[PDB]
């Protein structure tokens, strides 16, 4: 899987193909984060196969649909439990993020895992994603934004319109 | 009286890195530094204007040393406002870095 663009959260439900032994095999559900639904079903079959004696040939997808963020206008803290392969082992991490959507938080995890650990998306398994209250967060990067009277300036604002104009008479001012 | 044409530069021919298509010229137009601003200049006439030793007939005038190769803007090139132009004859390589007149006709405004 390529963690392309902003991921979506998919609810994938699958089961073993019914057989005379078991005419109604049990139903399984997973939370999948993927770029599109085609990738979402593919990853499902990759995960259930690791937990059950099942695979695409001997099973079917019963429901694939996007789970929509339920409070897209409310800031939340997300705890993420993931495992990943490094160059020389596997590890379990717990990570935290602040975001408005749970799929946005998961995307941050992939970019972050790529930035800080050079971990490609194909080597990352998001085990669990929870919304966490400010009092249960652990990472100081997230906790410093739990301040009702938070304030801070924007020092040294760099000129981003550096080629409009490309040549000017006045030098830029970085203080605002 | 005054100028009635926009100022352009003959930046170079159409090319990859090691192949050159001389039938298309890349033009840089003064003040046009993005692709969304090139829309005004599509289809407008272009003139490489120069002087030679021998006299030649001037439409509406008497023979002089001025000569012109006509062309027109055909499409935008890139993201920063370069346009592709085509002329009745491939531009001479000595024209690279020199003025190309871009006329205000055919008017669409």
């Amino acid at each position: 899987m390529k963690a392309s663009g902003t991921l979506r959260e998919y609810k994938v439900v699958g089961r073993c193909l019914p057989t005379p032994k078991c005419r109604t095999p049990p139903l399984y559900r997973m939370r999948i984060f993927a770029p599109n639904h085609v990738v979402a079903k593919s990853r499902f079959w990759y995960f259930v196969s690791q937990l059950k004696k099942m695979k695409k040939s001997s099973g079917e997808i019963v429901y694939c649909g996007q789970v929509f963020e339920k409070s897209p206008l409310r800031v939340k803290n997300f705890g993420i439990w993931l495992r990943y392969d490094s160059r020389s082992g596997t590890h379990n991490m717990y990570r935290e993020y602040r975001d408005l959507t749970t799929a946005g938080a998961v995307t941050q995890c992939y970019r972050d895992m790529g930035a800080r650990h050079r971990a490609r998306a194909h080597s990352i398994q998001i085990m669990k994603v929870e919304e966490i209250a400010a009092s249960k967060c652990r990472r100081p990067a997230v906790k410093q934004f739990h301040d009702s009277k938070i304030k801070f300036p924007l020092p040294h604002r760099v000129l981003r319109r550096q080629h409009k104009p490309r040549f000017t008479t006045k030098r830029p001012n970085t203080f605002f | 009286s005054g100028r009635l044409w926009c100022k352009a530069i003959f930046a170079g021919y159409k090319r990859g890195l090691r192949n050159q298509r001389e039938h298309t010229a890349l033009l840089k137009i003064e003040g046009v530094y993005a692709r969304d601003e090139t829309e005004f200049y599509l289809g407008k006439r272009c003139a490489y204007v120069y002087k030679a030793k021998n006299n030649t007939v001037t439409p509406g005038g008497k023979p002089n040393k001025t000569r012109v190769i006509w062309g027109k803007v055909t499409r935008a090139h890139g993201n920063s406002g370069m346009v592709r132009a085509k002329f009745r004859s491939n531009l001479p390589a000595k024209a690279i870095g020199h003025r190309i007149r871009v006329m205000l006709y055919p008017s669409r405004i």
Binding site: R166, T168, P172 | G97
Partner: protein, 199 residues
């Protein structure tokens, strides 16, 4: 006609990249105060870079090149030459469209200087990063006219200060004059404000 640039507070390679593309399109460029140009990284690791360049020489005849120019202007010039196809007539024509100066000699001392915000150090570097000064680096690899250029640059700044005070004087009169003739020019002041020229 001529694009005059001020090299103070510009990073060496970003200025060269823009300048090289400009003279290849047929524009004349003058860069003054090449000793005021900057390079990212601590001074020491940039001095080692030029000393490594200084060691490059034809083992059988050093006089045949490379030629290691020591002036901050010539260092910049060679850097723009490295971004041009200078072994072809088209590149050499462009290279002749560029003049480089230490200090600001006439006539550019009495002309307005433009900058390139895409090459300015205040824009392109993080403020905590170290950087080198082209003039100091040049002075410590054999450049001989650092002390003189500074001496003449201080004379120019003294004269430019008197010129600025004269211009501020002529601007204070300009503002006063607009009050004296406010009645007579009020109508023409409404046209300009109606169309955004005056706020």
């Amino acid at each position: 006609q001529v694009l005059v640039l001020d090299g103070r507070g510009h990073l060496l390679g970003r200025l060269a990249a823009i300048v090289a593309k400009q003279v290849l399109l047929g524009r004349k460029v003058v860069v003054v105060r090449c000793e005021g140009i900057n390079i990212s990284g601590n001074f020491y690791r940039n001095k080692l870079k030029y000393l490594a360049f200084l060691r490059k020489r034809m083992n059988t005849n050093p006089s045949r090149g490379p030629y290691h120019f020591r002036a901050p202007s010539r260092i910049f010039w060679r850097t723009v030459r490295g971004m041009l196809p200078h072994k072809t007539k088209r590149g050499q024509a462009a290279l002749d469209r560029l003049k480089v100066f230490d200090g600001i000699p006439p006539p550019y001392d009495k002309k307005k200087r433009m900058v390139v915000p895409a090459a300015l150090k205040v824009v392109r570097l993080k403020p905590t990063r170290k950087f080198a000064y082209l003039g100091r680096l040049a002075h410590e690899v054999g450049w001989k006219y650092q002390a003189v250029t500074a001496t003449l640059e201080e004379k120019r700044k003294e004269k430019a200060k008197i010129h600025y005070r004269k211009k501020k004087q002529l601007m204070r009169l300009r503002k006063q004059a607009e009050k004296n003739v406010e009645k007579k020019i009020s109508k023409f002041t409404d046209v300009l404000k109606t169309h955004g020229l005056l706020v």
